[PDB]
Design a protein around this ligand. Sequence first.
Ligand SMILES: [Cl-]
Ligand SMILES: [Cl-]
Ligand SMILES: [Cl-]
Ligand SMILES: [Cl-]
Ligand SMILES: [Mg+2]
Ligand SMILES: [Mg+2]
Ligand SMILES: [Mg+2]
Ligand SMILES: [Mg+2]
Ligand SMILES: [Mg+2]
Lengths: 227, 227
Amino acid sequence: VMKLQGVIFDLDGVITDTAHLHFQAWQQIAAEIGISIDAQFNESLKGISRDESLRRILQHGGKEGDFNSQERAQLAYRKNLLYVHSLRELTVNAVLPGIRSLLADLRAQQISVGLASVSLNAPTILAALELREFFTFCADASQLKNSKPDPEIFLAACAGLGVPPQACIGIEDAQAGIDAINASGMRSVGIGAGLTGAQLLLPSTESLTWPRLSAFWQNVAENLYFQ
Amino acid sequence: VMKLQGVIFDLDGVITDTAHLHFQAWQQIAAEIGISIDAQFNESLKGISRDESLRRILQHGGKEGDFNSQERAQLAYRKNLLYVHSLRELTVNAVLPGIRSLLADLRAQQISVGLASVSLNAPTILAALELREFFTFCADASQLKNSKPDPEIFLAACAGLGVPPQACIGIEDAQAGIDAINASGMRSVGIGAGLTGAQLLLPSTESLTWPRLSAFWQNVAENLYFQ
Ligand SMILES: [Cl-]
Ligand SMILES: [Cl-]
Ligand SMILES: [Cl-]
Ligand SMILES: [Cl-]
Ligand SMILES: [Mg+2]
Ligand SMILES: [Mg+2]
Ligand SMILES: [Mg+2]
Ligand SMILES: [Mg+2]
Ligand SMILES: [Mg+2]
């Protein structure tokens, strides 16, 4: 059996959820220019670029004509600033169920732990969650050329851990993330119903335990022709 | 470097294209009940169940009321019969470019070749294309419980070849197929722009050569920690 050398984690939707904080920042910037948006409006911002998100908010309040590209840039700066402050305010209680105990178990088993997050705010987030001590290496999102589903960020995490991708498990909650893990050569674990292409599919982070990951590893890593 | 033990092929969209033949069979059965459909109508049959495909044809001609479920079953039987006859009429020229030369090369290299097709007509098809002699094992689609993206059909092909999935390359043209290959533990090769999650993505079957597959294998199978 090939030895498991690393377990590499996506951040959003696996370690913690940042979606509500993104919306709350947009809602605050909107309110500061006299526009009311709600969680129902936030569906219109789901999977949308930063510039188009702001434009949709402006359209919603009939205010596209009141801001040029430079002034919109200033609104976007403030929105991001408020968002990052909210990340620094996260507590240990924002970690998803099962995650802290799994990280503790991996470290007790001397398994190296990687982070493959595309967020430039990842270190700020892990610090707030009080989880930095569990990670061996975190990929640098500021150096990323292609986001998921390109395997780059996962390949970067593996290289940082100093091991080949096939000696690692990757954990994701999104299809583009599963696709990126698969394309990199890593063994894929998905969190959430509906994901396809995962070698191990779990319904939530609570199902994510060391004994389960270890059993999964022993199953997929075995090769009669290496006995 | 782990030894490459098998290359496993999807049938439709990789070895040959059956889409036009499916449409031509539907068009003939439609004509036999006085209904004219064209290739433009065939978009409405794309990714549709057999029963709903027939119902849409009947609706198109205003004839839903003229056939009960048993009579529709008789129309479906004839459509399938015409379709299967057309498969038996396929010639060597229906094989996609690059495929026959690749199969010849794999066999010269003593690499076992598998088929992972969900079609019950696969053996009829390979016989017509004069390709049976290149295949070591073909998975039995009549025993299949879950179709792609479930990895079952690829796992069945690997088991039939007597080797673990990770010692095999799988080749697919569809996203559900790539997902199935990935979930099985096999190394994935995709044919067609737009596919995600493939370890090697090629634009067409013409790009699919032994030297390329071999270079791909040597790259992904290497592990410093096995030297
Ligand atoms: Cl992330
Ligand atoms: Cl998703
Ligand atoms: Cl097929
Ligand atoms: Cl597809
Ligand atoms: Mg995520
Ligand atoms: Mg704090
Ligand atoms: Mg296909
Ligand atoms: Mg013939
Ligand atoms: Mg894989």
